[PDB]
A paper describes a structure:
Kinases in this protein family are activated through binding of Ca2+/CaM to regulatory regions that either flank the catalytic domain or are located in regulatory molecules. CaMKII proteins form large oligomeric structures. The N-terminal kinase domain is tethered via an autoinhibitory helix and a calmodulin binding site to a C-terminal oligomerization domain that organizes the enzyme into ring-shaped oligomers.
To address this, we determined the structures of all human CaMKII isozymes in their autoinhibited state. Importantly, whereas the crystallized constructs of the α and β isozymes contained the catalytic domain and the inhibitory region but only a part of the Ca2+/CaM binding motif, the constructs of both CaMKIIγ and CaMKIIδ additionally contained the entire regulatory region as well as a part of the unstructured linker to the association domain. However, the autoinhibitory helices in all isozymes were structured only up to residue 302. Different crystal forms were observed, containing one (CaMKIIγ), two (CaMKIIα and CaMKIIδ), or four molecules (CaMKIIβ) in the asymmetric unit. Similar to the C. elegans orthologue, the substrate binding site is blocked by the regulatory domain in all human CaMKIIs. The alpha and gamma isozymes were crystallized in fusion with the His6-TEV tag.
Author numbering: -8 to 0, 5 to 23, 25 to 302
The structure:
């Protein structure tokens, strides 16, 4: 009744027996490597976690990530296919996503308008809305974690990396700690105030701003000054690039980039916003070449730093 009760969570050799390990894709605690299941042949991405070292707190964080990934089955979230416990290592086996970052694919297009921005943000908000409904907060929405499923026509945007995700109690806010990425951090996390689901919508507003113009609404080289701007919601819509952006897109950005999280738009309401919801009649169809060029520089900057 050990293996009968624990089942797929019981210690085993399921990974070593049923999969072959191939190259490293990334690294950070853990490594993500491509792998191929033998029995019915298919490609996956195994996150590999060395468990010999781990503290009680790190086990809880690993179990949390595993649980959260198991729970989330949505076309715009990268699916966990298995969670395998072996003697010294744990393996989270995910779908392999081969289309690369969303932001990289955008700069490679012939045409790119608001209507394409809205289409991306529609998919991104569907994933955020899904996780919020399941009382999960991602806490680290950013370009690096918005991937395309495949290089194929019509590939979905997929949310990745729930390494920082938290489970919340319905709509209750608490101090869950200082986590996230500088440029996308919410005022409430910087204030050290209680928080929850709204923090992910703040991040979506920053992403949405970048999808429209190709540069971030908040930046300073001095991180103390960056954080002051974010707390003050010190962004704007400079001309000339913002002059051709529809007032509807601007409206959605303002609602997402609202300092007080209680007043900030929800994912569910953002999905009912006309620019998202009635994209076809509301979103502009004019190509935004200046956005593609800024995005190129935005991607290069990030690549040059990493
Ligand atoms: C090309 N590719 C696909 C994936 C990937 C992938 C993940 C992509 N990320 C985000 C990591 C964002 S690179 C960063 N700067 N941080 C993950 C974090 C934790 C577990 C898995 C993944 C996933 O779920 N399926 C996949 O195919 C991946 C993961 C790490 C590095 C490259 C990579």
């Amino acid at each position: 009744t050990e293996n009968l009760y624990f089942q797929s969570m019981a210690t085993c050799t399921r990974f070593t027996d049923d999969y072959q390990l191939f190259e490293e894709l990334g690294k950070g605690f853990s490594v993500v490597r491509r792998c191929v299941k033998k029995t019915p042949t298919q490609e996956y991405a195994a996150k590999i976690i060395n468990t010999k070292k781990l503290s009680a707190r790190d086990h809880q964080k690993l179990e949390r990530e595993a649980r959260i990934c198991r729970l989330l089955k949505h076309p715009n979230i990268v699916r966990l296919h298995d969670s395998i416990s072996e003697e010294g290592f744990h393996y989270l086996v995910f779908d392999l996503v081969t289309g690369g970052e969303l932001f990289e694919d955008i700069v490679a297009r012939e045409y790119y308008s608001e209507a394409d921005a809205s289409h991306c943000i529609h998919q991104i908000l569907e994933s955020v809305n899904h996780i919020h409904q399941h009382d999960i907060v991602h806490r680290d929405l950013k370009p690096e974690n918005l991937l395309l499923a495949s290089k194929c026509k019509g590939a979905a945007v997929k949310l990745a990396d729930f390494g920082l995700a938290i489970e919340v109690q319905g709509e209750q806010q608490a101090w869950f700690g200082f986590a996230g990425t500088p440029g996308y951090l919410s005022p409430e996390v910087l204030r050290k105030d209680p928080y929850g689901k709204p923090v992910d919508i703040w991040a979506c507003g920053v992403i949405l701003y970048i999808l429209l113009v190709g540069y971030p609404p908040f930046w300073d080289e001095d991180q103390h000054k960056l954080y002051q701007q974010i707390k003050a919601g010190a962004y704007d819509f400079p001309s000339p690039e913002w002059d051709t952006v529809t007032p509807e897109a601007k409206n959605l950005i303002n609602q997402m980039l609202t300092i007080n999280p209680a007043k900030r738009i929800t994912a569910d309401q953002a999905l009912k916003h006309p620019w998202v919801c009635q994209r076809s009649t509301v979103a502009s169809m004019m190509h935004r070449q200046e956005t593609v060029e800024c995005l190129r520089k935005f991607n290069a900057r990030r690549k040059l730093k990493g």
